[PDB]
């Protein structure tokens, strides 16, 4: 059993070594000690999981579509391999969501942090939604939505329209409306409102980052009018 300073340190080593599972394990334990994570630790947890969650999602997209493009005992094998990837994926999200339920959200004493972790709960349910069986989908989707909505209300009350967390939340939440709920009307007005409130907000230093989220929002708006 190593202390917080040690695990954080291993986590930074693992990050450089590009061993993200290790990186994740470290930050999991750190979070499990129960103190409110500093910014730097929050960023470390997120990087680690984003990579450990992305390698699977990307794998699933590939195998899922080899399974679709086909039709065979080859198709049973793709399917079984899809299912194997999914179960690794569900595991990673349930670990993340549980870390959010027991630790990150309850302990967040700043709005910015609360919004960030809520957004993250919306993302991790969005991921379990992409891959749901068909019977729990509607339920998973409600969860994602509820968490993004909670995050959304806090970010309107508490943060500047150009804050990159608020804006990233708008982005992810609008992609959820588009890709997951199948609603492009909701996706559009959300992306649009957030983009305009931020523009109107320019009468806010200093994000080259806040602009990046803004370009992503408008790109989506242009891609969704066709």
């Amino acid at each position: 059993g190593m202390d917080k300073n040690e695990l954080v340190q291993k986590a930074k080593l693992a990050e450089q070594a590009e061993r993200y599972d290790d990186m994740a394990a470290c930050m999991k334990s750190v979070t499990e000690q129960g103190a409110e994570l500093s910014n730097e630790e929050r960023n470390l947890l997120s990087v680690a999981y984003k990579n450990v969650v992305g390698a699977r999602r990307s794998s699933w997209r590939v195998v899922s579509s080899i399974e679709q493009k086909t039709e065979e005992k080859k198709q049973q094998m793709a399917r079984e391999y899809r299912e194997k990837i999914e179960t690794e994926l569900r595991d990673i999200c349930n670990d993340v969501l549980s870390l959010l339920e027991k630790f990150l959200i309850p302990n967040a004493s700043q709005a910015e942090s609360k919004v960030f972790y809520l957004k993250m709960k919306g993302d991790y349910y969005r991921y379990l939604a992409e891959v749901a069986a068909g019977d729990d989908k509607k339920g998973i989707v409600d969860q994602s939505q509820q968490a993004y909505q909670e995050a959304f209300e806090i970010s309107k009350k508490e943060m500047q329209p150009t804050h990159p967390i608020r804006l990233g939340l708008a982005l992810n939440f609008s992609v959820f409306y588009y890709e997951i709920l199948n609603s492009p009307e909701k996706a559009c007005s959300l992306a649009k409102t957030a983009f305009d409130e931020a523009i109107a907000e320019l009468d806010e230093e200093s994000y080259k980052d806040s602009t990046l989220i803004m370009q992503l929002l408008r790109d989506n708006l242009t891609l969704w009018t066709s």
Partner: peptide, 10 residues
């Protein structure tokens, strides 16, 4: 760097 952490849905 920064935005990498925010897990942007692009």
């Amino acid at each position: 760097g920064x935005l990498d952490x925010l897990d942007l849905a692009s």
